[PDB]
Design a protein around this ligand. Structure first.
Ligand code: 8QW
Length: 260
């Protein structure tokens, strides 16, 4: 099987992602270099949808200059029928990798944290708030994490999380949305990387779950662990009041990412 994009031919090794109307393929080009290609069929896309796509793409293409913790987009072709995006290929996404994993090296955890902070900080500096961060938004590429999307393109549905509520901040439920909202969600991802679950994972009922998330009389548990700085990061990211919640520039100066 094969594909053409801006005049260059790519052979398909396998499919590494799917969707109703979208696929991601691992591929090789004419020089035997490997890449990932996202394909989007526009057949049934309305104008608002289309504009959400073009906006996500414009941002990806822009923000590439600004951080190597954003996935590399080398090229794209777009027509009225489809989109093809040629990207660097990662090894696996963070969600899949977390599920495959029984314990995480503290050093590796701290290193991924920093990467996530950096990428999210970068989008905040261009006025983007993702507001739906989750492990699937991050990709392992050469033992670094890279953010792959900005929360702008309309989402859909045909390893998997989407419409999930476990990372949703309290003020997204009540609904205002600020950069602080993305801190909660990163906080939830860090908590999963620390304790093996998300902070409200055990509450099965979705409505009970949402109620617990906004209820300040519901205490979140932070079992003691040998890295006290990690435990303080979690406590600080997961304040329900956004005005109380630590900020990204603060988290980047925190002893958890700075010390040793
Ligand atoms: C072998 O590699 C693997 C394996 C396994 S797996 C199956 O092991 O779990 C898993 C992963 C990999 N690799 C991989 N490499 C890459 C590179 C890039 C992307 C990627 C990048 C950006 C997006 N962006 C969007 O979808 C956004 C929302 C968008 C943008 C424009 C639109 F028109 C519409 C939507 C989507 C996908 C994903 N992967 N995934």
């Amino acid at each position: 099987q094969s594909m053409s994009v801006k005049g260059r031919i790519y052979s398909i090794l396998k499919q590494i992602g799917s969707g109703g109307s979208s696929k991601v393929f691992q591929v090789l080009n004419e020089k035997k270099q490997i890449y990932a290609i996202k394909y989007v069929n526009l057949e049934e896309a309305d104008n608002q949808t289309l504009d959400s796509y073009r906006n996500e793409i414009a941002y990806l293409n822009k923000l590439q200059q600004h951080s190597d913790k954003i996935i590399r987009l080398y090229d794209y072709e777009i027509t009225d029928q489809y989109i093809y995006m040629v990207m660097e290929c990662g090894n696996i996404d963070l969600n899949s990798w977390l599920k495959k994993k029984k314990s995480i090296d503290p050093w590796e955890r701290k290193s991924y944290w920093k990467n996530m902070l950096e990428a999210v900080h970068t989008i905040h500096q261009h006025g983007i708030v993702h507001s739906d961060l989750k492990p699937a938004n991050f990709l392992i590429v050469d033992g670094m994490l890279k953010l792959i999307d900005f929360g702008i393109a309309n989402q859909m549905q045909p390893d998997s999380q989407v419409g999930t509520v476990n990372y949703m901040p309290p003020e997204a439920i009540k609904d205002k949305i600020s950069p602080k909202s993305d801190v909660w969600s990163l906080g939830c991802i860090l908590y999963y990387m620390t304790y093996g679950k998300t902070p409200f994972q055990q509450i099965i009922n979705q409505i009970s779950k949402l109620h617990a998330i906004i209820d300040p009389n519901h205490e979140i548990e932070f079992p003691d662990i040998p890295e006290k700085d990690l435990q303080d990061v979690l406590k600080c990211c997961l304040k329900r009041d956004p005005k109380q919640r630590i900020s990204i520039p603060e988290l980047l100066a925190h002893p958890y990412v700075q010390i040793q």
